[PDB]
Amino acid sequence: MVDAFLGTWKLVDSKNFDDYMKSLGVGFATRQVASMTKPTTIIEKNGDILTLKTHSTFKNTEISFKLGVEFDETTADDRKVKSIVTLDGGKLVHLQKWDGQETTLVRELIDGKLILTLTHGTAVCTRTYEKEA
């Protein structure tokens, strides 16, 4: 049941995103621009196929996936990963695997805000998105 996540969301807070990017090996110039970027995330469904768009003035991505079915993904920072997205404890959990590394991108709804928690290595980044009408 992912319906409450659907819609258009805009970034309104970010904590520790530089640490997360640095942990992934993102270069300093990309981190600089990324630290000042406010993406718009659009989450749509057609049956159990979700499409998650992330749009910004810097990088854009789009993925489509069936919940619970692995898919290939090429991330905004150009990692080629094996991914799966599932609903777990009411949270939309996106796991990426590559070269034996793992990162999770976890989305949950708290007081009407979408909280995205990004974990890689020890780095834990929390980004907050609010719904656009």
Q: How far is the CB of 3 from ligand VCA (least distance, A)?
A: 20
Q: Report how far residue 68's alpha carbon sits from residue 64's, in angstroms, rounded to the nearest whole number.
A: 12
Interface residues with ligand VCA (CB under 6 A) are 11, 21, 26, 30, 34, 37, 39, 41, 54, 56, 58-61, 75-77, 116, 127
Of 75 and 101, which CB lies nearer to ligand VCA in the complex structure?
Answer: 75
Query: Which amino acid makes up residue 93?
Result: V
- The secondary structure of the chain as a DSSP string is --GGG-EEEEEEEEESHHHHHHHTT--HHHHHHHHT---EEEEEEETTEEEEEEE-SS--EEEEEETTS-EEEE-TT--EEEEEEEEETTEEEEEEEETTEEEEEEEEEETTEEEEEEEETTEEEEEEEEEE-
Shortest Å distance, C-beta 2 to ligand VCA: 17
CB of 90 to ligand VCA, least distance (A): 19
Binding residue per annotation — 129?
yes
Q: How far is the CB of 109 from ligand VCA (least distance, A)?
A: 16
Taking the least distance from each CB to ligand VCA, the nearer of 47 and 92 is 92
Is 20 annotated in a binding site? The answer is no
Residue 114, CB-side half-sphere exposure with 13 Å CA sphere: 25
34 versus 85: smaller Cβ distance to ligand VCA: 34
Judge whether 86 is annotated as a binding position: no
Going by the annotation, the residues of the binding site for octadecanoate are 127-129
Going by the annotation, the residues of the binding site for hexadecanoate are 127-129
Going by the annotation, the residues of the binding site are 127-129
